[PDB]
């Protein structure tokens, strides 16, 4: 089922987390990498993602699976470039990773790259998966 | 909603009938194609499909919603396989169709191909639907 998509996204070894989340009706995680962050995304966090406030999360970022993130570019609700780019808030600790959230008709494809992995590479991977999903009526 | 599985299963046009039957406790059709055969499957018939005694299959087949079928292969109760290939029985030069029945924890998935669709194609669609369900603990 949806498990194949997560395996597909993680296959090249450049990412550490991935998830496909339904946001219509009742937000639910359809498949996510086990023991990680995205598997714990909540309906409230999803609500913020597809929300009306597109600039409030610019000073104060947001949270995905509890993880605080900094929005570095928001184009989630934009015609064409239906993506959002974020970084993992290294408020404490040290390692920061690039995340990309892409949106389709019924889902939100989330990808988190490993340390050092170029952001645009995460954007490419996340964006192409969603492009495949939307053309497949999803 | 279970009817969405029916729509999904019926989308490519290869099938003419489909159903998701709950066999545990009190057996019933959770979803089927209105105006077709599977929708009329009885608890007695469901009992025949999941009983441990497979005697009648090899005696003279079995019926699905009244429709008599011949058992090509019965591995329904067999672990790791959980599938049974059938073929409708006809009178006159009326066509015969491939039917596959797969089982999960709480469900029986039924599919009847249209004339000319190979049994192997029917078996894959069904098995794939059954693997998805069992992954969701169904």
């Amino acid at each position: 089922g949806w498990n194949a998509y997560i395996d597909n996204l993680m296959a090249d070894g450049t990412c550490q987390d991935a998830a496909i989340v339904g946001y219509k009706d009742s937000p639910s995680v359809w498949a996510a990498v086990p023991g990680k962050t995205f598997v714990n995304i909540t309906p409230a966090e999803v609500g913020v993602l597809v929300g009306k406030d597109r600039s409030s999360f610019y000073v104060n970022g947001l949270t995905l699976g509890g993880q605080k993130c900094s929005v570095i570019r928001d184009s989630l609700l934009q015609d064409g470039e239906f993506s959002m780019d974020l970084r993992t808030k290294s408020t404490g600790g040290a390692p920061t990773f690039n995340v990309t959230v892409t949106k389709t008709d019924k889902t939100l494809v989330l990808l988190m790259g490993k340390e050092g992995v170029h952001g645009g590479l995460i954007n490419k991977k996340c964006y192409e998966m969603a492009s495949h999903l939307r053309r497949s009526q999803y | 909603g279970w009817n969405a599985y029916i729509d999904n299963l019926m989308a490519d046009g290869t099938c003419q009938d489909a159903a998701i039957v709950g066999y545990k406790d009190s057996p019933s059709v959770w979803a089927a194609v209105p105006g077709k055969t599977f929708v009329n499957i009885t608890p007695a018939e469901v009992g025949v499909l999941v009983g441990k005694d497979r005697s009648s299959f090899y005696v003279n087949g079995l019926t699905l919603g009244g429709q008599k079928c011949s058992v090509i292969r019965d591995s329904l109760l067999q672990d790791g396989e959980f599938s049974m290939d059938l073929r409708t029985k006809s009178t006159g030069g009326a066509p015969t169709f491939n039917v596959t029945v797969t089982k999960t924890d709480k469900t029986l998935v039924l599919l009847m191909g249209k004339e000319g669709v190979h049994g192997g194609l029917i078996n894959k669609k069904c098995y794939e639907m059954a693997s998805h369900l069992r992954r969701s603990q169904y």
């Binding site: 359809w30 497949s136 | 279970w2 969405a4 599985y5 999904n8 369900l133 169904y138």
Partner: peptide, 10 residues
């Protein structure tokens, strides 16, 4: 690039 999977149960 697999085909879209079934939706989640119920």
């Amino acid at each position: 690039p697999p085909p879209p999977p079934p939706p989640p149960p119920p």
